[PDB]
């Protein structure tokens, strides 16, 4: 077994330019479901809760944010302890 006949195929776009267009999320704020669809309040770079922006689960690309959020929220609401 020896290396013979190698192949290479890569694709990339050549767009050398920078401009404000995309927005980055900071963390989850609140959660609410409407029209059989669950949405989460996400904060975009520069944007504040004042704008009250909601994002669908499908678009939600940050599960960890919810995992931890539930931890804090749980304490807020009065429930029961279980192990």
């Amino acid at each position: 077994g020896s290396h013979m006949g190698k192949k290479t195929k890569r694709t990339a776009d050549s767009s050398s330019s920078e401009d404000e267009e995309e927005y980055v999320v900071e963390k989850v704020l609140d959660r609410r479901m409407v029209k059989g669809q669950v949405e989460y309040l996400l904060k975009w770079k520069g944007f504040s809760e004042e704008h009250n922006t909601w994002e669908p689960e499908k678009n939600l690309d940050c599960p960890e944010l919810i995992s931890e959020f539930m931890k804090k929220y749980k304490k807020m609401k009065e429930g029961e302890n279980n192990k």
Partner: peptide, 18 residues
């Protein structure tokens, strides 16, 4: 430069007749 996962505001929405 961009490294962290980032996307634009809301994508994925068909515009049906009904």
């Amino acid at each position: 430069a961009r490294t962290k996962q980032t996307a634009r505001k809301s994508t994925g929405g068909k515009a049906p007749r009904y």
